[PDB]
Amino acid sequence: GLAEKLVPAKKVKNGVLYKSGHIKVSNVRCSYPHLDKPYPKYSITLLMPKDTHGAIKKIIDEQIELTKKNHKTGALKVAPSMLFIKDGDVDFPDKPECEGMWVISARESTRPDVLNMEREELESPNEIAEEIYGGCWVSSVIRPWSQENKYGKRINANLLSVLKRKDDEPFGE
């Protein structure tokens, strides 16, 4: 799978930047998983605790700037509201699980690698949905991409892998 192919560039607390621009965010809480079947797109929201993910957030900001620079129509300007990463303490007032979190949204049209706690690829949609529920903790590999169309200018994140890390209280989404 993906993990065996990636070549690390920089490892920090709770994260890795790869030479290919992939970013691993480790030990984050998931929300709204759509890993079983597309919904077409697969998707997840990652709630990344600010106090333990500062360095990887800094790297994410840097990679967002690189992605703007290399957009296919030339350097792309994107407002903070149109990025895949948002501030849980400002942009999610009525969602308490977002307190003290960076909120990352990632999507893909093809299924990401989905690994259970034993680092085994899952295949059954029902098993995937049971294994990785909203509220559990995961680690995930994402990579930014730039978009410019009639609906706006965005920096999005491809969802490339999700690894189950720990059980916790379900959000019941």
Residue numbers in the entry: -1 to 37, 45 to 178
What are the paper's exact sentences on this?
The hypothetical protein ORF6 of the Enc34 phage is conserved among all Nazgul-like phages and consists of a single domain, currently annotated as a domain of an unknown function DUF2815. Here, we present structural and functional characterization of the Enc34 ORF6 that allows us to establish its function as a single-stranded DNA-binding protein (SSB) and extend this annotation to other DUF2815 family members. The SSBs are ubiquitous within all kingdoms of life and in DNA viruses, and protect ssDNA intermediates during replication, repair and recombination. In this study, we show that the Enc34 ORF6 is structurally homologous to the gene 2.5 protein from bacteriophage T7, and present a high-resolution structure of ORF6 in complex with ssDNA, which reveals for the first time the structural basis for the ssDNA-binding mechanism of T7-type SSBs.
In T7 gp2.523 and T4 gp32, the removal of the acidic C-terminus results in higher affinity for DNA, and to further test the DNA binding properties of the Enc34 ORF6, a recombinant protein ORF6ΔC was constructed with the C-terminal 21 residues lacking. While co-crystallization attempts using the full-length protein were unsuccessful, the truncated ORF6ΔC protein could be crystallized both in absence of DNA and in presence of oligo-thymidine (dT). ORF6ΔC crystals without bound DNA diffracted to a slightly higher resolution (1.34 Å) than those of the full-length protein and had three molecules in the asymmetric unit. Due to different packing of loops and N-termini in the crystal, the three protein chains have Cα RMSDs of 0.8 to 1.1 Å when superimposed with the full-length ORF6.
